[PDB]
């Protein structure tokens, strides 16, 4: 009947193909804004003073960068944590010099992905599922917000955020190892265990289910035509697969319940990523990694060397070369 | 009960002994607040100001008068809200907007307290008024400002100029400009020019750093604070070794600001995840499918295909 | 020591720029993705068999029925993400196929690095940057950083070379 009622019925319909919902009205236009700025700025952005030391940095395809070296340059350090939109700038040849589109794209992309998580709640509630997909999607959201928002707040500049490009990502990672020693940090090792265990468990489950498919086709055609869509028959003998796994390793490390197996798959890599999401946020506030410098000492008092005392030399080599034209006072980068 | 809790702090500021201000001259000092500034157009500025740099959110609070006046506001407001809700009931625009159950009430409080934790983290890392530098230590920008001021006071008394000392790349080694025209220190504290500390503000004039005051008006207690803050800058480690990661095991130091900030950021982020748990589960339990899709009545096989 | 090996590749070989290593990280991290996706989907579009909210107690291991609504999860991920699976044969086979493809396509690049056919510097940006001074891409910062790795760590990493660099020879950075 009424305009608002018909509009709400359309926007909470479930028959339009890509669902919208009520978080969708912030998810859709803001991410379209971020995409439409990023595609332009990856192609035709003028060089950007990332350092504030009057040295512009080329990042776009038109100025002698390929797909790997192409990147959206982050904002200058003199800009700091100041909110710097288009309308506060003088011209569009002045906004793009001082780290323009990074400030726009990051603040758009974060508001996009949080509302995308809300949308993943909302469509599950509209269909009648149980609502915990957004809880699992909270992990890469945290991993994005730690490098795009939390760490530049901690360092006090938007310069030290991750550059939006392939060859810029590694120049973020190596200098982060230089100043913070991420490898000697126990949260990061928990995240390494998370991603490696996630790959192991994915390959293991996809092996042990594909190894028990019930023969329903021939041996000339595809082995994927044995599953007609929307049936009620369990296409993999989970009893035989669990018996094979129990003969393979252990009978008390069973996980005979399929639901317990799926809880374990849902909770291994998510909790793996959450600890690195905390670890970046802790290293943002200058709470450093480990430090085993000059630990092994002989009976006289001289200094022996270990693998930590080689990683110290590698991090010295990175540190005395990162930001080569800025640092004068001997610390605090 | 929370309103009386706020009025306890108001009474402790106004009548009982006093509160340690960090902006009294001649070093920080305990004083008695006489005129708490309770201007509504000033106090409701901070709740609306932009949460980015320079402007800042309520972490940019500076005056103990403003702090105690805002607590006067909260002490009146919470008592008024209590007298409101004891005698009123919720109105139907809120009786249909909410999920009224047990776990839902937990779900709202978890998200609220997660926001509380994030605000506490950004308070304890940046502020130096409510968390004074003499008690908790120097802050992030304060360390860099202290280092630049210490080396300027060092190199001034030897013969080199403080103004015409051109740095490596043309910019000033010691003094340069802001983006908005002020006169500040150089190096990498151009990201930290928004700093306002009591050891630096008497040396700060209308355009910023007064060159005449940096020639003539340096105080010995300011020299001591600058000499100790660059020594005890917040550069921790998990095994409690101070400095950078490329530093030998010299000083057992981690600042308490780092522990407060990191611990409350993690403990707020987990409450946020708990809110994303319970706000889904409560509305699902109120709807009636918190235990799974029923096999007979299924909401998908009635709908149209999408093609 | 594995950390020393990682910084060894990062400072001598520049193992970062290897497309085979890009394949490897894509395989590993996409498998870690799809594990979490499948685990948070299957037990979330679950059926109704038990009475209490503890849904773990409502599974017969000897069962001829299903335990998760394939139609519902298909409609879910079709309306959020776009493309969505419809064949749980192919789903578990794809979970099989992703990380082994990543690890084999990393092994080929480790072979190519063993023969010292490293993914070190290009032609074009280097010959352009030797001519025009102010170029300074993240690429030409990573190369100038890896040189700082390789000139500092070597003199204590490999003593059988018998080299002691003077401090003037080291990449200093002009008093950082």
């Amino acid at each position: 009947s009424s305009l608002w009622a018909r509009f709400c019925e359309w926007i909470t319909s479930t028959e339009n193909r890509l669902y919208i919902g009520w978080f969708g009205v912030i998810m859709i236009p803001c991410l379209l804004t971020a995409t439409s700025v990023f595609i332009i700025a990856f192609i035709a952005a003028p060089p950007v003073d990332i350092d504030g030391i009057r040295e512009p940095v080329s990042g776009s395809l038109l100025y002698g960068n390929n797909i790997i070296t192409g990147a959206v340059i982050p904002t200058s350090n003199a800009i700091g944590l100041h909110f710097y939109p288009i309308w506060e700038a003088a011209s569009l040849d002045e906004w793009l010099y001082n780290g323009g589109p990074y400030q726009l794209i990051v603040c758009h992309f974060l508001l996009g992905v949080y509302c995308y998580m809300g949308r993943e709640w909302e469509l599950s509630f509209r269909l009648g599922m149980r609502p915990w997909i957004a809880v699992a999607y909270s992990a890469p959201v945290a991993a994005a917000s730690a490098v795009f928002l939390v760490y530049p707040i901690g360092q006090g500049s938007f310069s030290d955020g991750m550059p939006l490009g392939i060859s810029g990502t590694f120049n973020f990672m190596i200098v982060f190892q230089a100043e913070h020693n991420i490898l000697m940090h126990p949260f990061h090792m928990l995240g390494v265990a998370g991603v490696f265990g996630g790959s192991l468990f994915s390959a293991m489950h996809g092996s042990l289910v594909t190894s028990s498919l019930i023969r329903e086709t021939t041996e000339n055609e595809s082995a994927n035509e044995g599953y007609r869509f929307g049936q009620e028959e369990e296409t993999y003998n989970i009893v035989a697969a669990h018996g094979y796994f129990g003969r393979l390793i252990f009978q008390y490390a069973s996980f005979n319940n399929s639901r317990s197996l799926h809880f374990f798959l849902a909770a291994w890599p998510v909790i793996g990523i959450w600890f690195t999401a905390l670890g970046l946020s802790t290293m943002a506030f200058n709470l450093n990694g480990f430090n085993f410098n000059q630990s092994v000492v002989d009976s006289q008092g001289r200094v022996l060397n270990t693998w930590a005392d080689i990683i110290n030399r590698a991090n010295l080599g990175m540190e005395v070369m990162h930001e080569r034209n800025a640092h004068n006072f001997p610390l605090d980068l | 009960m929370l309103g009386l809790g706020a009025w306890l702090l108001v009474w402790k500021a106004m009548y009982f002994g006093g509160v340690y201000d960090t902006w009294a001259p001649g070093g920080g000092d305990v004083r008695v607040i006489t005129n708490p500034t309770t201007n509504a157009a000033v106090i409701f500025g901070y709740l609306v100001k932009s949460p980015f740099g320079g402007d800042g959110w309520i972490c940019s609070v500076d005056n103990m008068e403003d702090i105690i006046g805002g607590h006067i506001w909260i002490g009146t407001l919470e008592i008024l809200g209590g007298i409101w809700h004891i005698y009123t009931t919720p109105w139907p625009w809120a009786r249909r907007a909410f999920v009224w159950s047990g776990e839902a009430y937990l779900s709202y409080s978890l998200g609220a307290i997660g926001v509380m934790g994030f605000i506490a983290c950004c308070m304890s890392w940046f502020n130096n008024t409510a968390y004074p530098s003499e008690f908790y230590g120097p802050t992030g920008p304060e360390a860099s400002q202290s280092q630049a001021f210490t080396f300027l006071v060092r190199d001034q008394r030897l013969g080199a100029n403080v103004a015409s000392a051109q740095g490596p790349t043309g910019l000033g080694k010691y003094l340069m400009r802001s983006p908005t025209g002020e006169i500040i220190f150089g190096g990498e504290t151009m990201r930290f020019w928004d700093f306002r500390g009591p050891w630096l503000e008497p040396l700060r004039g209308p355009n910023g750093l007064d060159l005449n005051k940096l020639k003539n008006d340096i105080q010995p207690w300011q020299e001591r604070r600058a000499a100790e803050y660059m020594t005890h800058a917040p550069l921790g480690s998990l095994n409690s070794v101070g400095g950078v990661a490329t530093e030998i095991n010299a000083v057992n130091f981690v600042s308490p600001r780092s522990w407060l900030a990191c611990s409350h950021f993690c403990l707020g982020f987990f409450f946020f995840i708990g809110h994303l748990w319970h706000a889904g589960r409560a509305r699902a339990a109120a709807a009636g499918f918190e235990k799974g899709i029923d096999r007979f009545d299924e909401p998908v096989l009635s709908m149209r295909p999408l093609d | 020591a594995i950390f020393r090996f990682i910084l060894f590749f990062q400072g001598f070989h520049n193992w970062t720029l290897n497309p085979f290593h890009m394949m490897g990280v894509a395989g590993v991290l996409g498998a870690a993705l799809l594990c979490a996706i499948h685990g948070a989907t299957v037990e979330n579009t679950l059926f109704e068999d038990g009475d209490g909210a503890n849904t773990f107690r409502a599974f017969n291991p000897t069962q001829a029925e299903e335990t998760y609504s394939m139609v519902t999860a298909n409609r879910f991920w079709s309306q959020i993400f776009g493309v969505a699976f419809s064949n749980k044969r192919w789903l578990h086979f794809f979970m099989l196929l992703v990380p082994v493809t990543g690890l084999w396509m990393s092994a080929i690049g480790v072979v190519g690095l063993a023969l010292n056919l490293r993914a070190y510097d290009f032609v074009s940006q280097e010959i352009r940057a030797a001519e025009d001074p102010e170029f300074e891409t993240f690429y030409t910062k990573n190369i100038l950083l890896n040189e700082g790795i390789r000139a500092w760590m070597a003199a204590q990493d490999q003593p059988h070379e018998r080299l002691v660099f003077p401090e003037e020879v080291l990449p200093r950075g002009n008093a950082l």
């Binding site: 192609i43 395809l61 390929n66 797909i67 869509f229 | 295909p305 093609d307 | 139609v71 298909n74 776009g82």
Partner: peptide, 30 residues
């Protein structure tokens, strides 16, 4: 010259994404 090749490859990848989303086979029932 090669910038046009780069742009053509990126736009073609996005086009295949578009046709994969919208012009798929309908996942049909029993």
């Amino acid at each position: 010259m090669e910038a046009l090749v780069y742009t053509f490859l990126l736009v073609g990848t996005l086009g295949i994404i578009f046709f994969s989303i919208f012009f798929r086979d309908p996942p049909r029932m029993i």
